[PDB]
Design a protein around this ligand. Structure first.
Ligand SMILES: *[C@@H]1O[C@H](CO)[C@@H](O[C@@H]2O[C@H](CO)[C@@H](O)[C@H](O)[C@H]2NC(C)=O)[C@H](O)[C@H]1NC(C)=O
Ligand code: NAG
Ligand code: NAG
Ligand code: CA
Ligand code: CA
Ligand code: CA
Ligand code: CA
Ligand code: CA
Ligand code: CA
Ligand code: CA
Ligand code: CA
Lengths: 4, 285, 54, 296, 5, 292, 303, 67, 5, 4
């Protein structure tokens, strides 16, 4: 998904 | 008994030589291979359809700038449309954790029944989509573990040359009940989430060729070959998860790596079936 | 003087059984299946053992 | 006493009931053909070497197109044996295929390239076959090509014959063979002939430089006017026969290995032989021929 | 095999 | 006796008495002449829309000043619209032509907007960042950005970018575009290989950079790019395209004329040397489907 | 012994003949101007990118320079032009009325005062924008609406022809709508001019002073009489006699919209109706001095 | 015989009024013209002469106060 | 100014 | 430009  | 048998069975032997000669003639052909390739050829599957082909299966196509003809699976509907399928998922049969050259040259198998998973080469996709003036359209077809399916079309689909790491670009999302995941998704952690998860204009990346927007390696981590951007909202080349539902506890790195399309299903939901195919745009109205 | 015929019709059979065995196996790759079978060369030799001692 | 020349007859006559029954049965099975379902691997190239360099790691049936002029064809790639990249040209392992064939068949090629692996959806098992003299010639001439020949006895033991150089001329040149740079454990049967034979007896079984011959096309070095005295006719299938051979990879597949003259259709050593390793009366359990680009 | 003269 | 003169004056007395009455009427008329204010040459057009294309689609003909109100916009605002003869309506958000306006502004000013809007399009300005955000992301329809440059020799060039959009102030107005769509000015937002460090091109690309001003640092530098180069822009340690930089007359300038030694002019590396400041500059957007 | 000085008392001749000569000059000037008025003055006020409800909000948005801006006090009212003074005491000032050269006539009717009139701004030398304020009256409708959006303060400034200046601050300022005749209201005074609007003329005593008090008065134009001068004689109305539109009582202590007398000093035989009709602020210089500069600015108060 | 001064003394009574009326008009026109600057493309540069009016109207009262 | 009563 |  995304990379916090 | 004297010679009344040194003849009876000396005659049998002449008929045996005869039937045996008959057997010989019936054992000269190879086993029958159920997978056959069709004769029609063209620049793409639409071109082949335009040439009267009637069924979906394996055909050789040879784009304009291609120096060698290659085999592809064509999907021909009764409507006279010819889709060139370049990606497929349906069971966890083929491993998609491949390297640059493998995603470039292609992997998996091609069937006439279209019941096999695969990844047509990146180079092949590039040669088809950019082969000429005419623009193409990409249709992403998904299916959950409940028999429900959805789609999403992208106009002016094109993949760049390897010199530009096979960058993906499209003019605009053309609609589809699956939603535009290539536009990114608002996961809610940081306002920049939707941006860093958009795919339009992204370069391709595998674990051994990092061209993403992440300081780390998205393809290495999520274990695939795909157009990463720190990292994704659409991951059709991700790990095949049986059941659909999965958690970060079952992932090797804690991040979602399944076959997701965030605008249709949660990221922790891997798709059951997946299809990526293109067709000249004018073919859609 | 039939001995010159068995020193033939026996060996001929020895060549034929073998031929058919090979011929039949060669269909394993053309037809639905090949008859599983075995060739008894021994009995043929032992048949030519006494035919030889005599 | 000396009436036992009777039991031999009722015996033969009985043997015949056996045989007829068996042949008739095979005849039955042949009403329906064997079939395979080889889904084609996506990756492709000019040969197996290029294919393994493109990621094709597994040993199976691939598609190759040696030249833009020739139609892409199916061949079995051996991506395991000594670094992979091997293109199987000929293969023997079970006698499932008939090699005693004419010129056209050896020209075009014949047999089964591969068959299905248990449940899998692809043919990861090679079958018995001969690629075809035309295809083979062209492959060898694209550039420096090496040749690896492997065999194994009905006891598990195996040896090999390597030829760093290998060449087959076109049909016009009667597919004249040429090999060099030998090394192995089988014995240089192709370039030296039978080690057991002496003087001109040995040299006349040399294969390097011979022309291809089938039983309907005599091009062997056995210059005779007698039509019955031709190497191919007498030794089984198509091969680069001299007068006649030291090796014969396409001979008759005798089950068990050991065979004799009264077993052979013509009383000659027409089996899957390699004299330099097991004499002329031993038919190998496995026999193969693979090619691959060399080094320069 | 060979073929003697 | 004597007064053949008393009539004389009585004449003049009555004379100019009537003269006075006539003159006051002539004055009343003047008064009607001087009631109107001076004619202000700058007028605002009546049509309105979500953007300039929308306005164009509504028959608007000439380029000038119009009010527009994007979907999420809570208040209408003025903008300069460029409408060609082909029915295309561009929304202009940045302009440079002479050094008239100071671009060394703060966060609030680059956010709200500064400079002036003219009907004749002969004026420098920076439509607010907020307005640019509201327009570019107002709806599904993607926008395209056109960067137009003019050197001091009368030559012009362009650089188009597709899927142009500006982030919310929440994400410091990040600049984002899908891909460079061509133009003879080159893709400077891709960074430029000035030679030095191999990370040159990487630290001088702009796509995906957050906006920065001397008082609101969001660049990829340890120092403050906007502070040094004196401008507001999407810095990245720092730039290869800097259209809000210092205006240098004649274009040619050096590190000896700059305050901190670095190139702070209006540059576009892929078209001219960083020591060549542009003469004119235009940043305008229009629905992407309008260029295809 | 009888006609000693009458042959001399014909001095009248020069007085009359002079006047007749004076009339010729006057007749000429009026025509010259009449002609000059065939073509109008013009401005090219390019509009500042930044906007807002009033000048306060605009300066809070980065509007540092004093010039003409475009504002929209409310979403229902059309954006209009106004001059923002962003330098005087913390800025954010929206000019309501301005005098500085007599370039504009203030003796107007009710409708003009209601709509507004004059030049908001003019161009500065080279510059492509209007940085100088012109002489004008924003408009009673606009002014009212501006003072009623919330607490509003009022700053009135003036300067004599000698350079000096004083001011009048009112922390509270309100103007009701037209239906309420734009009734004025002010409080919280402070400054150096003098509390003219709330206390009346300082030089006046008793009811005389009290009748020149402006706080609470209604707005009057020479064509609309709302002053506190209760009388049936049509000639006796403050607006008519003293010049312009204003919150006249009976009549004034301050007359920002009076006649622009040049030089400052004027007398009764100079004034049209013999009254103090100039730009007057009695509390600072009496009624016989017309200021050189006079202005009225407004700004949200504190909350 | 004396029917003279009553006319002269009344005329001078009228001139002073024309004089005061003129001063007002002089000033009224001086102010009306200037209000044209911010309306017309041009403004007539002029000048009022109050000293003169006040000198004559001053001189007049000297004559008016004879009989 | 003012107007006396 | 680039800031090294
Ligand atoms: C208010 O002013 C008036 C005059 O402006 C003063 O009242 C008298 O008014 C009459 C005419 O109405 C004059 O004849 C008188 O001369 C005025 N009185 C004087 C001498 O000033 C009145 O005095 C003033 N009010 C106060 C109490 O100061
Ligand atoms: C040359 C020579 O010595 N001949 C011998 C001979 O014993 C044998 O009969 C012959 C068969 O042709 O081959 C050799 O073994
Ligand atoms: C070759 O075979 C012949 C058969 O007659 C034999 O005599 C000879 O010894 C063999 N080789 C030689 C020439 O030694
Ligand atoms: Ca978010
Ligand atoms: Ca990376
Ligand atoms: Ca045969
Ligand atoms: Ca011959
Ligand atoms: Ca570099
Ligand atoms: Ca920094
Ligand atoms: Ca008037
Ligand atoms: Ca009244």
């Amino acid at each position: 998904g995304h990379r916090p | 008994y004297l010679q009344e048998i040194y003849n009876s069975n000396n005659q049998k032997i002449v008929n045996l030589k005869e039937k045996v000669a008959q057997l010989e003639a019936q054992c000269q052909e190879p086993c029958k291979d159920t997978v056959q390739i069709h004769d029609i050829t063209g620049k793409d599957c639409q071109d082949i359809a335009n040439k009267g082909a009637k069924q979906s299966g394996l055909y050789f196509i040879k784009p304009l700038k291609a120096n060698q003809q290659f085999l592809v699976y064509c999907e021909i509907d009764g409507s006279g449309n010819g889709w060139t399928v370049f990606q497929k998922r349906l069971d966890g049969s083929v491993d998609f954790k491949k390297n640059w050259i493998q995603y470039k040259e292609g992997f998996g198998h091609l069937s006439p029944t279209g019941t096999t998973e695969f990844w047509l080469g990146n180079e092949k996709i590039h040669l088809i989509s950019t082969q000429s003036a005419i623009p193409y359209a990409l249709r992403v077809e998904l299916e959950d573990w409940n028999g429900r399916t959805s789609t999403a079309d992208y106009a002016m689909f094109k993949v760049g040359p390897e010199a530009d790491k096979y960058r993906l670009t499209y003019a605009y999302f053309a609609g589809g009940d699956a939603g535009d995941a290539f536009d990114g998704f608002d996961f809610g952690d940081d306002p920049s989430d939707k941006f860093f998860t958009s795919h339009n204009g992204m370069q391709f990346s595998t674990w051994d060729n990092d061209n993403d927007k992440f300081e780390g390696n998205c393809a290495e981590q999520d274990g695939s070959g795909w157009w990463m951007n720190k990292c994704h909202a659409g991951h059709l080349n991700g790990v095949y998860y049986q059941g659909g539902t999965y958690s970060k506890a079952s992932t090797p790195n804690g991040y979602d790596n399944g076959i997701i399309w965030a605008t249709w299903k949660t990221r922790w939901y891997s798709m059951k079936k997946t299809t990526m195919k293109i067709i000249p745009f004018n073919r859609l109205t | 003087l039939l001995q010159k015929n068995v020193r033939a019709q026996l060996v001929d059979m020895k060549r034929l059984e073998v031929d058919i065995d090979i011929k039949i196996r060669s269909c394993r790759g053309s037809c639905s299946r090949a008859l599983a079978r075995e060739v008894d060369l021994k009995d043929y030799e032992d048949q030519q053992k006494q035919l030889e001692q005599v | 006493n000396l009436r036992v020349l009777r039991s031999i007859l009722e015996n033969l006559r009985s043997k015949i009931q056996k045989l007829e029954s068996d042949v008739s049965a095979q005849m039955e099975y042949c009403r329906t053909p064997c079939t395979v379902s080889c889904n084609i691997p996506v990756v492709s190239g000019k040969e197996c070497e290029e294919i393994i360099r493109k990621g094709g790691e597994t040993s199976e049936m691939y598609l190759i197109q040696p030249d833009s002029s020739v139609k892409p064809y199916r061949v079995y790639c051996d991506m395991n044996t000594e670094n992979g990249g091997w293109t199987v040209i000929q293969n023997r392992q079970d006698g499932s295929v008939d090699f005693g064939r004419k010129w056209d068949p050896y020209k075009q090629g014949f047999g089964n390239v591969a068959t299905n692996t248990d449940g899998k959806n692809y043919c990861g098992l090679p079958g018995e076959y001969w690629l075809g003299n035309d295809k083979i010639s062209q492959l060898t001439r694209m550039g420096p090509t090496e040749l690896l020949i492997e065999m194994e006895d009905w006891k598990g033991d195996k040896v090999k014959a390597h030829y760093g150089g290998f060449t087959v001329q076109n049909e016009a040149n009667k597919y004249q063979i040429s090999v060099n740079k030998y090394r192995g454990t089988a014995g240089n049967a192709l370039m030296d002939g039978a080690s057991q034979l002496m003087g001109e007896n040995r040299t006349m079984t040399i294969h390097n430089g011979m022309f291809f011959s089938t039983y309907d096309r005599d091009n062997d070095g056995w210059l005779t006017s007698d039509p019955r005295k031709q190497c191919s006719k007498e030794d089984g299938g198509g091969w680069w026969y001299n007068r006649c051979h030291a090796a014969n990879p396409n001979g008759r597949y005798y089950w068990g290995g050991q065979y004799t003259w009264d077993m052979a259709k013509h009383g000659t050593d027409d089996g899957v032989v390699w004299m330099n390793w097991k004499g002329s009366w031993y038919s190998m359990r496995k026999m193969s021929m693979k090619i691959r680009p060399f080094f320069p | 095999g060979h073929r003697p003269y």
